Amino acid sequence: SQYSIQQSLGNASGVAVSPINADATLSTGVALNSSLWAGIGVFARGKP
Amino acid sequence: LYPEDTPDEEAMVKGRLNKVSVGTSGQMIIDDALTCCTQDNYLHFQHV
């Protein structure tokens, strides 16, 4: 309908905005400063 | 006249047929300036 925004705009009159690029700002979230311990054992209560 | 139909923008531009539309504020406008020239050069625009 109206107020809609297209993205291709191929060989026809109109206006269109491309989706945001945001590729030169790629970070990585790993949170290296975190440590957890895993172990096996024999206990009194718990799901085996 | 035919609310159930829809334009054929690409076919219209290839066939050199100016089309009406609905611009801002809701008044109908003419939204193309193509002549009857078939060659794809500067000559098919209207003002040249």
CB contact under 8 A, B10 and A13: no
Using DSSP's 3-state secondary structure scheme, residue B28 falls into strand
DSSP A19: P
CB contact under 8 A, A12 and B13: yes
Q: Which one, of B25, B29, B45, B42, lies nearest residue B13 by Cα?
A: B45
DSSP B18: -
Q: Is B44 exposed, middle or buried (0-12, 13-18, 19+ CB in 10 A)?
A: middle
Interface contacts A/B by beta carbons within 8 Å: 9
Q: What is the resolution of this structure in A?
A: 3.5
Answer whether B19's CB lies under 8 Å from B32's CB: yes
**Beta-bridge partner residues of B28:** B22
The dihedral built from the CA positions of residue B15, B16, B17 and B20, taken in this order, carries a sign that is positive
Answer whether A9's CB lies under 8 Å from B27's CB: no
Q: How was this structure determined?
A: cryo-EM
Quote the tokens at residue B16. 């050199």
Using DSSP's 3-state secondary structure scheme, residue A38 falls into coil
* Minimal-distance CA residue of chain B relative to A3: B24
CB contact under 8 A, B13 and A2: no
Task: Report how far residue B9's alpha carbon sits from residue A16's, in angstroms, rounded to the nearest whole number.
Answer: 15
